Structure 1
Amino acid sequence: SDPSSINGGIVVAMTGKDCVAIACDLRLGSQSLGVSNKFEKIFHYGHVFLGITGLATDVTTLNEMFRYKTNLYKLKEERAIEPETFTQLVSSSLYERRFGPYFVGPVVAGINSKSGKPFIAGFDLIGCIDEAKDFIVSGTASDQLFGMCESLYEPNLEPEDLFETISQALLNAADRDALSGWGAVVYIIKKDEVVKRYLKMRQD
């Protein structure tokens, strides 16, 4: 059908004060049939976190693509790449294959080490940088995510207010969507310390 709804997937991302959090589901389907409840859609190059939604194979292709580009950045200029600089590379890689593109929708989430600001950004198929300082949502339960996320969220949250909001936001769209859910992992990204917390949730 849709080339970005044939295995589903979602990514939600939110900012708080002095922290960000990003989270994905763990579902890989082939249409109707569930194949796996343990495929990641979040990856980490350094202290940047890149969540990638959309078609199954291009999540994986694109992970090893940026794995290649992040290595050459770090080696030449002798530091881990910053969130803001990286966002520009996520845009260009999509745009190079302007026709017949990568059928993804990534989410960049970090906290800059040079300024200490939460910073997040988004992309469509072709990739238009979507600034925010709220939250950016992407995937196949994104219509639901945009409503749900906005309603709970209060501008700026504490590092563990932020775990309760982005967890509920993700659960409630994911159990009203058919191609999302089925086990999920929520990350809380503070300055220097990332915790990966799997979530108890509905498998049916």
Structure 2
Amino acid sequence: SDPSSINGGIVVAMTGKDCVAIACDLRLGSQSLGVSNKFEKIFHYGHVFLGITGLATDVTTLNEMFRYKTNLYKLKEERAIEPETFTQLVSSSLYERRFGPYFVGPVVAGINSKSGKPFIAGFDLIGCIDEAKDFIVSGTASDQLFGMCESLYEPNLEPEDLFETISQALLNAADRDALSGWGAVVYIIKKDEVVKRYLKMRQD
């Protein structure tokens, strides 16, 4: 009984040409038993998106805690938090519980509102920043997502092609994992527009 393997779920973020993409599966289960087909794992604060995969209760607590922190940050600084600052905040918040960790693998994705640079990043249970400009995968099907993203990704993709790439990656990674699937959501994030798309998957 591994906490990061009880509920399951997958999140994958990718970068394109002046855009990003972040996708997750919609399954929440208890070992073999599947419970919720509508458990989304991506939450946005201002314009920075965060996908949390792992123990579902820790996912929800981190979502609420980061909403708390980003709201207070906007109230104090009078500006929305940027993806890099939010990544550092997630790292610090995760490491603050070094010996009582959250069993989650957060992934940050966004576009810096001042520089327009696409920025994605990933963490472990204790907040090790993985700053990769190509793709960031997390969840129970982390190896399948790694293989699909390493085989499919090419730099500087338009949103219409980045969507297809990330969707195929997540779909073919979820079909080879028992604890992942049951639906999928993909956010294609540009500087002035963010499109949410529900995918069609096999429900097994």
Which secondary structure state, in structure 1, belongs to the residue aligned with residue 3 of structure 2?
coil
> 1:88-103 counterparts in 2 under 5 A?
88-103=88-103
Show CA shifts across 1:107-136 (max 9, x none): 000000111100111101111110111000
Query: Secondary structure at the residue paired with 2:17?
Result: coil
- Secondary structure of the structure 2 residue equivalent to 1:168: helix
Deviations 1:78-107 (A, max 9, x none): 111110111111001111110020010000
Instruction: Note the C-alpha offset of 1:56.
Output: 1.0
Compute the displacement of 1:201 (Å): 1.4
In structure 2, how many angstroms separate the alpha carbons of the residues matched to 1:165 and 1:47? 22
Q: Secondary structure, in 3 states, of the residue corresponding to 1:40?
A: coil
Where in structure 1 do 4 or more consecutive aligned residues deviate above 2 Å? Answer: none
Q: Secondary structure at the match of 1:132?
A: coil
Q: Structure 1 residue 186: deviation in Å?
A: 0.9
Aligned-partner SS, 1:198? strand
Q: For 1:13 and 1:186, how far apart are their aligned partners in 2?
A: 9
Partner of 2:159: helix, strand, or coil?
Answer: coil
**Cα shift at 1:76:** 1.1
Unaligned runs of 5+ in 2: none
Post-superposition Cα deviations, 1:22-55, rounded to whole Å, max 9, x if no partner, equal 0000100011100010011100100000000110
Deviation for aligned residue 1:10:
0.6
The Cα shift of 1:198 comes to 0.3
Matches of 1:83 and 1:118 in 2, distance apart?
9
Q: TM-score of the superposition, structure 2-length normalised?
A: 0.98
Deviations 1:47-69 (A, max 9, x none): 00000011010000011101110
Question: Displacement, 1:77?
Answer: 1.1
Percent sequence identity over aligned pairs:
100
Residue 8, structure 1, aligned to residue 11, structure 2: no
1:186 corresponds in structure 2 to 186
| Cα separation, 2, equivalents of 1:151 and 1:10 | 18
Cα drift, residue 148 of structure 1: 0.9
How far is 1:192 from its partner?
1.4
Q: What value does the CA root-mean-square deviation take over the aligned residues?
A: 0.7
CA deviation after TM superposition for structure 1 residue 195, in Å = 1.0
C-alpha deviation, 1:159, in angstroms: 1.2
**Structure 1: runs of 5 or more not aligned:** none
Aligned to 1:101, the other structure's residue is in SS state coil
* Structure 2 residue matching 1:146: 3-state secondary structure: helix
